[PDB]
Design a protein around this nucleic acid. Sequence first.
RNA 1: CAGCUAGUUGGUGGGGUAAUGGCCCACCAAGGCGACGACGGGUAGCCGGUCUGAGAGGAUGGCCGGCCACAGGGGCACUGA
RNA 2: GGAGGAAGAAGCCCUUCGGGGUGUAAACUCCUGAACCCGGGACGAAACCCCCGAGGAGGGGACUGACGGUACCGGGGUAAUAGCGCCGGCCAACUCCGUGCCAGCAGCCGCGGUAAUACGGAGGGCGCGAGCGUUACCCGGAUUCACUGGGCGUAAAGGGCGUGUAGGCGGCCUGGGGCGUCCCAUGUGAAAGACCACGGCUCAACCGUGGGGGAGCGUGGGAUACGCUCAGGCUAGACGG
RNA 3: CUGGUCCACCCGUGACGCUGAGGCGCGAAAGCGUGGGGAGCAAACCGGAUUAGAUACCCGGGUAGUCCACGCCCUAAACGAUGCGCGCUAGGUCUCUGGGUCUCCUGGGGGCCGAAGCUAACGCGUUAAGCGCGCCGCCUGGGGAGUACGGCCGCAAGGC
RNA 4: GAGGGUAGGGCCCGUGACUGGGGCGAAGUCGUAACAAGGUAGCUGUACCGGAAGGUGCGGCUGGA
RNA 5: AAAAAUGUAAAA
Lengths: 138, 99, 124, 208, 151
Amino acid sequence: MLTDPIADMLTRIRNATRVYKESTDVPASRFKEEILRILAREGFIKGYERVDVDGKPYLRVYLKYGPRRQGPDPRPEQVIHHIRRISKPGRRVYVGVKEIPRVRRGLGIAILSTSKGVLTDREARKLGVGGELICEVW
Amino acid sequence: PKKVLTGVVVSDKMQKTVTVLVERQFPHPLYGKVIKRSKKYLAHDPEEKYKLGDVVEIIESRPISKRKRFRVLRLVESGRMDLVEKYLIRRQNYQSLSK
Amino acid sequence: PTINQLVRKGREKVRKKSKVPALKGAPFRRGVCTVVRTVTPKKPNSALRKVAKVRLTSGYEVTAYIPGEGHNLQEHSVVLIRGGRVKDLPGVRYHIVRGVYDAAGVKDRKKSRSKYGTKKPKEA
Amino acid sequence: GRYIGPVCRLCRREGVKLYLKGERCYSPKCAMERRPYPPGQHGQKRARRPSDYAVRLREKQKLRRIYGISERQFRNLFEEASKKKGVTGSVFLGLLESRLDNVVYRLGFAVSRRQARQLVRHGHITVNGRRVDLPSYRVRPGDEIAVAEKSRNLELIRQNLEAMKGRKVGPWLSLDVEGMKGKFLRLPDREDLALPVNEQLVIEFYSR
Amino acid sequence: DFEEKMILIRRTARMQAGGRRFRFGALVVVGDRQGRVGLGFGKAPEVPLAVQKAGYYARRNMVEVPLQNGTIPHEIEVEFGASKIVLKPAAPGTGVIAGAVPRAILELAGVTDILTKELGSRNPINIAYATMEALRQLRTKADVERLRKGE
RNA sequence: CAGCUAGUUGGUGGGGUAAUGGCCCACCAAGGCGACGACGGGUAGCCGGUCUGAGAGGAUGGCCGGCCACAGGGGCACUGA
RNA sequence: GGAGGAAGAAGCCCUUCGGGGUGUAAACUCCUGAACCCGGGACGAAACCCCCGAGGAGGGGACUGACGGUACCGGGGUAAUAGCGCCGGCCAACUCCGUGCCAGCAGCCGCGGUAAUACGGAGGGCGCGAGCGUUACCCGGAUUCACUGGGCGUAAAGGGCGUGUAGGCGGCCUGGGGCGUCCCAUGUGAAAGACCACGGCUCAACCGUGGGGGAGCGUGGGAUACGCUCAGGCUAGACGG
RNA sequence: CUGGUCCACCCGUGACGCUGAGGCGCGAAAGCGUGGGGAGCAAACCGGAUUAGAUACCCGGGUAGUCCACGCCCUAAACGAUGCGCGCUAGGUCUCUGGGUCUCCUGGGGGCCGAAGCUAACGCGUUAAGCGCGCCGCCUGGGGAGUACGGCCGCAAGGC
RNA sequence: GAGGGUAGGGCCCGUGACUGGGGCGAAGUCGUAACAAGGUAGCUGUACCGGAAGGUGCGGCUGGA
RNA sequence: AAAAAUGUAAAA
Ligand SMILES: [Mg+2]
Ligand SMILES: [Mg+2]
Ligand SMILES: [Mg+2]
Ligand SMILES: [Mg+2]
Ligand SMILES: [Mg+2]
Ligand SMILES: [Mg+2]
Ligand SMILES: [Mg+2]
Ligand SMILES: [Mg+2]
Ligand SMILES: [Mg+2]
Ligand SMILES: [Mg+2]
Ligand SMILES: [Mg+2]
Ligand SMILES: [Mg+2]
Ligand SMILES: [Mg+2]
Ligand SMILES: [Mg+2]
Ligand SMILES: [Mg+2]
Ligand SMILES: [Mg+2]
Ligand SMILES: [Mg+2]
Ligand SMILES: [Mg+2]
Ligand SMILES: [Mg+2]
Ligand SMILES: [Mg+2]
Ligand SMILES: [Mg+2]
Ligand SMILES: [Mg+2]
Ligand SMILES: [Mg+2]
Ligand SMILES: [Mg+2]
Ligand SMILES: [Mg+2]
Ligand SMILES: [Mg+2]
Ligand SMILES: [Mg+2]
Ligand SMILES: [Mg+2]
Ligand SMILES: [Mg+2]
Ligand SMILES: [Mg+2]
Ligand SMILES: [Mg+2]
Ligand SMILES: [Mg+2]
Ligand SMILES: [Mg+2]
Ligand SMILES: [Mg+2]
Ligand SMILES: [Mg+2]
Ligand SMILES: [Mg+2]
Ligand SMILES: [Mg+2]
Ligand SMILES: [Mg+2]
Ligand SMILES: [Mg+2]
Ligand SMILES: [Mg+2]
Ligand SMILES: [Mg+2]
Ligand SMILES: [Mg+2]
Ligand SMILES: [Mg+2]
Ligand SMILES: [Mg+2]
Ligand SMILES: [Mg+2]
Ligand SMILES: [Mg+2]
Ligand SMILES: [Mg+2]
Ligand SMILES: [Mg+2]
Ligand SMILES: [Mg+2]
Ligand SMILES: [Mg+2]
Ligand SMILES: [Mg+2]
Ligand SMILES: [Mg+2]
Ligand SMILES: [Mg+2]
Ligand SMILES: [Mg+2]
Ligand SMILES: [Mg+2]
Ligand SMILES: [Mg+2]
Ligand SMILES: [Mg+2]
Ligand SMILES: [Mg+2]
Ligand SMILES: [Mg+2]
Ligand SMILES: [Mg+2]
Ligand SMILES: [Mg+2]
Ligand SMILES: [Mg+2]
Ligand SMILES: [Mg+2]
Ligand SMILES: [Mg+2]
Ligand SMILES: [Mg+2]
Ligand SMILES: [Mg+2]
Ligand SMILES: [Mg+2]
Ligand SMILES: [Mg+2]
Ligand SMILES: [Mg+2]
Ligand SMILES: [Mg+2]
Ligand SMILES: [Mg+2]
Ligand SMILES: [Mg+2]
Ligand SMILES: [Mg+2]
Ligand SMILES: [Mg+2]
Ligand SMILES: [Mg+2]
Ligand SMILES: [Mg+2]
Ligand SMILES: [Mg+2]
Ligand SMILES: [Mg+2]
Ligand SMILES: [Mg+2]
Ligand SMILES: [Mg+2]
Ligand SMILES: [Mg+2]
Ligand SMILES: [Mg+2]
Ligand SMILES: [Mg+2]
Ligand SMILES: [Mg+2]
Ligand SMILES: [Mg+2]
Ligand SMILES: [Mg+2]
Ligand SMILES: [Mg+2]
Ligand SMILES: [Mg+2]
Ligand SMILES: [Mg+2]
Ligand SMILES: [Mg+2]
Ligand SMILES: [Mg+2]
Ligand SMILES: [Mg+2]
Ligand SMILES: [Mg+2]
Ligand SMILES: [Mg+2]
Ligand SMILES: [Mg+2]
Ligand SMILES: [Mg+2]
Ligand SMILES: [Mg+2]
Ligand SMILES: [Mg+2]
Ligand SMILES: [Mg+2]
Ligand SMILES: [Mg+2]
Ligand SMILES: [Mg+2]
Ligand SMILES: [Mg+2]
Ligand SMILES: [Mg+2]
Ligand SMILES: [Mg+2]
Ligand SMILES: [Mg+2]
Ligand SMILES: [Mg+2]
Ligand SMILES: [Mg+2]
Ligand SMILES: [Mg+2]
Ligand SMILES: [Mg+2]
Ligand SMILES: [Mg+2]
Ligand SMILES: [Mg+2]
Ligand SMILES: [Mg+2]
Ligand SMILES: [Mg+2]
Ligand SMILES: [Mg+2]
Ligand SMILES: [Mg+2]
Ligand SMILES: [Mg+2]
Ligand SMILES: [Mg+2]
Ligand SMILES: [Mg+2]
Ligand SMILES: [Mg+2]
Ligand SMILES: [Mg+2]
Ligand SMILES: [Mg+2]
Ligand SMILES: [Mg+2]
Ligand SMILES: [Mg+2]
Ligand SMILES: [Mg+2]
Ligand SMILES: [Mg+2]
Ligand SMILES: [Mg+2]
Ligand SMILES: [Mg+2]
Ligand SMILES: [Mg+2]
Ligand SMILES: [Mg+2]
Ligand SMILES: [Mg+2]
Ligand SMILES: [Mg+2]
Ligand SMILES: [Mg+2]
Ligand SMILES: [Mg+2]
Ligand SMILES: [Mg+2]
Ligand SMILES: [Mg+2]
Ligand SMILES: [Mg+2]
Ligand SMILES: [Mg+2]
Ligand SMILES: [Mg+2]
Ligand SMILES: [Mg+2]
Ligand SMILES: [Mg+2]
Ligand SMILES: [Mg+2]
Ligand SMILES: [Mg+2]
Ligand SMILES: [Mg+2]
Ligand SMILES: [Mg+2]
Ligand SMILES: [Mg+2]
Ligand SMILES: [Mg+2]
Ligand SMILES: [Mg+2]
Ligand SMILES: [Mg+2]
Ligand SMILES: [Mg+2]
Ligand SMILES: [Mg+2]
Ligand SMILES: [Mg+2]
Ligand SMILES: [Zn+2]
């Protein structure tokens, strides 16, 4: 039955990226779109689109990576260095406008659900609003 | 102003008086989880028109009796016995906690 | 644990007891020296330690260690308790102040006169 | 107050030519030019690389002794520095330099940093009129650090001024040698200064 | 030809019929005090010689460190299994406030304003490893948008 | 410390006060409270503040300021705004 | 007290007996001048009180100082108290004699049983200074009650296993509400404090003056993303044939 | 007589779910209670031998118990020393069982070796000790001590 | 209606002949059970028994081969 | 599958 679709979703990315897959699927959902919407706006995913898994609306998240590396164990760079959820179904994390975190001194982004939509760590600040801290990415 | 609460009638076994439960949720002072606690209030119903399980509103009013400083307002919905259960069942289990 | 576990149970407060039962943690306690005897040290050492039981005025009765080279405390001496155990003597958890009351200081001592209660001399 | 004890003896500890005196220290005898090794029976023995803290300590004591001021006040200013914004590091040295008696040295009135204290103490120095005797007193930007009237025609004073003819001093300072008075233009930028000490280390130390 | 400085020199031994011979180990780090720094741990049956080995071993390894007027670009939680160290960029005039080991690391890294602390284990050797790989994960503004570009 | 409650919970009528009110009285109805910790025991005046600490937190309430309570222990009412 | 002042007194300690150390330290020269002396000597005080007007407004006149003959100002003026802790590692500071598991130190590990940098004395050094140091208690280090920020195969720790009550958590889509939450406005959060700024007392401490935003709570308005709530639909979870 | 479990057909229901303080039930062996049974085995106990000693190791004999019924006890290295559930993350190999025009494919279960990854190491690794969410359980130096007191359960031993 | 008095319960503290175990100790006595098949693999719940560690029984676990 | 007990108390 799962709990937070987002939680396991971000994990799809994580586990996939770790093994360097082309892309991975995940049950289609409103919020997940918003997630990828911003997860592409800032540039962490090649893109996405609704697909089919035996009459089951999924979502193909096409992963992005880095250039090939020289030296021992040619490990391709990770575009998504790290992505972890903050507002858990256990602890609903609500932050104020002048409380929104600064992911790794700007280098990162804080995907959160504002009261007027969904914005980045900076985008939410610009519009001057706060919301549920979905997760951070860097 | 005159504080008003939206609770449920959980006890109507008194004269012109009715007990009402009120659940209020809020972030934990340290752990920020949306915890939920409650309390029982004794309302003044000179009409007795409000029955059990009747979700009603209560307003901070003139002292009626000892542990009674509130009065009823209006019904929100009649059939709500299911909630009454949650209260009753909690009571039951208590009897099986002692010795 | 989980969040709810904390919501309910909660982190247990540390709380530590004192290494010295000297009442109001008073800097020093006054008492009358009852026994003045020398006890042998513990495991790695052996050097007859000059100790003295002191029946406090605060109703207690403990053993205290006399530093310095010798002393002058008999069966009725009065004295102060510094508070500080000796890892070489089992039970002794209170030092005994020098130069205070019936307890004289140390003779001949030069350095560290403070601890051993010895008013500075004059060379001239 | 200041440690009255032998001073040209500390020059040897820091291992750096420190001008705690006046003429003699410029002479062929800062007392280290003679004995480039720390005091004590030892010193003339192969030592060992101190610990991080140890170096930070020695390094600090270098700066402190330089201004011959109580560690109490010394520390109190370190805090005063952290208190405000700016590059706390240089700022410290900054306020250190803003000390009245100190400016009296960097203005020539006195031959030694210690002799400066003495003069300033006896009110031999004035500021905008007031005979400020307080060796402390942080001289704000823009002041008349002149010499008191009675103190004007003084033997020791003259000697100091006469020798202080020309000789550029304090880019952030002016000097009306004619009337025996000086001014504090601006706050001495870090670059302008140049002490044999490393501020960064002195900073790290007081963070414990 | 960068600036060289060691961390610690322990003395490990070996049980064996008769006596207990030894083998010294020295941790050494190098750097020009500006982005270029390398760490090497040289082991040898002799204190000086070990340092000598540590020399080549250190001058071997190395890592770029995107400075910033003396400070580090960003903060990072680098866990090296046992130990756990975190660095954070400070405002000029702060100071290299770090553990004994990471101190001489960033010091030769041309760092002057950094906030660090050791967590979990504090084993000198491990801590060192951590600090290095840590700098090895550092990413400049350029580095970021570079990989994020991929046009 | 796991069950507690007879003015106990509520109602009608009354007393009493500047005033609401079991605050108190007579009569009537069985209710009232509790593991969201009742009842018991222990300890303690509360806050503004103070101490420490990267912060969160922890510790604390001397001085000054605000509210409270007591004036040898304990009870009472008179005078009066 | 300040400046100077020996290839460097005397004594004291060390020594490969050459010399090294105390150490510019002192002696001594010269300059200043705390203490002390003489003279002067406050602010804090203005108002109630008197007068014209109208007994007011406005305006003009008059009394009072505990501290105090104090602070402060001018002049005359003598080099004028220094102490405490530490010196094995942590931790900054090394050597000599005495002692011999004694004496005795000890915060942690430990030291002492003939050559102790660890006991005691000394020489010397290190730190600090009218203070130094001990004891006591609080926070810290302690990410060792872990929200930030721990962990549970063998190191402390999975309940012996199942059933289920409370409670906690909640699959994809559409709709109203707007409880949580988010934003604006506003009442509030008094003074003292903390911080920033300027200023007062020779500086500071102390203090005056002004500026800042503050959590939370009260009211009004706004939004709807996820949580919540009522309502409609689906089949990917669970169930059933 | 009866529980659980798996595969195929995608037929019905329509979020009905996960977890689970207390509680309720089960719970090896030994043990207790009334009654029944008793071959072999077998604490205790008797004897022989070894040994300085030998209340033991081995040998000879032997009771309770082991078995049935009904009732109570409720502990264990109850061990994978690894709580329960849903999701994602190479694969090679053999074995139990189920579906299918089948030198092979597909679902559930058991065991070895290993990608990535975690780990103090060992070692784990689609049967995780991996990556992530939800809930209960629990730990916070050793000894003292699973003791002492209190409370509850039991005929008792003793247990929580 | 303060308090006083009488009778009876609850909780807490101190104390007590004697007694139970525990901690502690440069040395004792008696054995040797444990770590190597520790010279009977060990551990373990329970039971019985013995100067003592411990042995033996019923079952169980490897942290045995 | 191997009959046979025990070494107190001062330094890295
Ligand atoms: Mg690829
Ligand atoms: Mg796309
Ligand atoms: Mg409600
Ligand atoms: Mg009434
Ligand atoms: Mg009434
Ligand atoms: Mg004597
Ligand atoms: Mg006497
Ligand atoms: Mg020169
Ligand atoms: Mg002072
Ligand atoms: Mg100059
Ligand atoms: Mg000069
Ligand atoms: Mg003068
Ligand atoms: Mg001065
Ligand atoms: Mg100039
Ligand atoms: Mg310039
Ligand atoms: Mg200079
Ligand atoms: Mg600090
Ligand atoms: Mg500090
Ligand atoms: Mg770790
Ligand atoms: Mg009555
Ligand atoms: Mg009435
Ligand atoms: Mg009435
Ligand atoms: Mg009255
Ligand atoms: Mg009434
Ligand atoms: Mg009534
Ligand atoms: Mg009745
Ligand atoms: Mg409570
Ligand atoms: Mg009390
Ligand atoms: Mg009290
Ligand atoms: Mg902290
Ligand atoms: Mg602070
Ligand atoms: Mg008082
Ligand atoms: Mg009195
Ligand atoms: Mg009285
Ligand atoms: Mg009274
Ligand atoms: Mg009156
Ligand atoms: Mg001199
Ligand atoms: Mg004068
Ligand atoms: Mg005058
Ligand atoms: Mg006047
Ligand atoms: Mg007037
Ligand atoms: Mg009057
Ligand atoms: Mg008139
Ligand atoms: Mg008139
Ligand atoms: Mg008048
Ligand atoms: Mg006078
Ligand atoms: Mg004068
Ligand atoms: Mg004068
Ligand atoms: Mg003169
Ligand atoms: Mg002189
Ligand atoms: Mg002199
Ligand atoms: Mg003179
Ligand atoms: Mg010290
Ligand atoms: Mg020493
Ligand atoms: Mg010494
Ligand atoms: Mg040292
Ligand atoms: Mg002796
Ligand atoms: Mg000593
Ligand atoms: Mg020890
Ligand atoms: Mg000797
Ligand atoms: Mg020796
Ligand atoms: Mg010594
Ligand atoms: Mg020492
Ligand atoms: Mg010592
Ligand atoms: Mg000395
Ligand atoms: Mg503490
Ligand atoms: Mg803490
Ligand atoms: Mg702990
Ligand atoms: Mg721990
Ligand atoms: Mg602790
Ligand atoms: Mg831990
Ligand atoms: Mg364990
Ligand atoms: Mg289990
Ligand atoms: Mg439920
Ligand atoms: Mg909705
Ligand atoms: Mg509508
Ligand atoms: Mg609306
Ligand atoms: Mg809100
Ligand atoms: Mg809020
Ligand atoms: Mg506001
Ligand atoms: Mg507000
Ligand atoms: Mg305001
Ligand atoms: Mg406030
Ligand atoms: Mg205000
Ligand atoms: Mg305020
Ligand atoms: Mg400002
Ligand atoms: Mg100013
Ligand atoms: Mg000012
Ligand atoms: Mg000021
Ligand atoms: Mg001023
Ligand atoms: Mg000023
Ligand atoms: Mg003020
Ligand atoms: Mg203000
Ligand atoms: Mg302003
Ligand atoms: Mg709020
Ligand atoms: Mg069946
Ligand atoms: Mg069957
Ligand atoms: Mg099929
Ligand atoms: Mg079909
Ligand atoms: Mg279907
Ligand atoms: Mg169907
Ligand atoms: Mg349907
Ligand atoms: Mg279940
Ligand atoms: Mg039950
Ligand atoms: Mg049962
Ligand atoms: Mg049985
Ligand atoms: Mg039987
Ligand atoms: Mg029996
Ligand atoms: Mg038979
Ligand atoms: Mg017989
Ligand atoms: Mg036999
Ligand atoms: Mg037999
Ligand atoms: Mg029997
Ligand atoms: Mg059978
Ligand atoms: Mg059983
Ligand atoms: Mg267990
Ligand atoms: Mg299930
Ligand atoms: Mg098959
Ligand atoms: Mg299938
Ligand atoms: Mg399989
Ligand atoms: Mg394996
Ligand atoms: Mg690998
Ligand atoms: Mg590893
Ligand atoms: Mg490995
Ligand atoms: Mg697998
Ligand atoms: Mg698989
Ligand atoms: Mg597999
Ligand atoms: Mg314990
Ligand atoms: Mg037990
Ligand atoms: Mg008991
Ligand atoms: Mg148990
Ligand atoms: Mg009565
Ligand atoms: Mg009575
Ligand atoms: Mg009685
Ligand atoms: Mg009684
Ligand atoms: Mg008793
Ligand atoms: Mg006893
Ligand atoms: Mg007896
Ligand atoms: Mg025992
Ligand atoms: Mg013994
Ligand atoms: Mg004996
Ligand atoms: Mg023994
Ligand atoms: Mg055995
Ligand atoms: Mg074995
Ligand atoms: Mg074994
Ligand atoms: Mg057994
Ligand atoms: Mg088994
Ligand atoms: Mg084998
Ligand atoms: Mg065999
Ligand atoms: Mg023996
Ligand atoms: Mg031995
Ligand atoms: Zn010099």
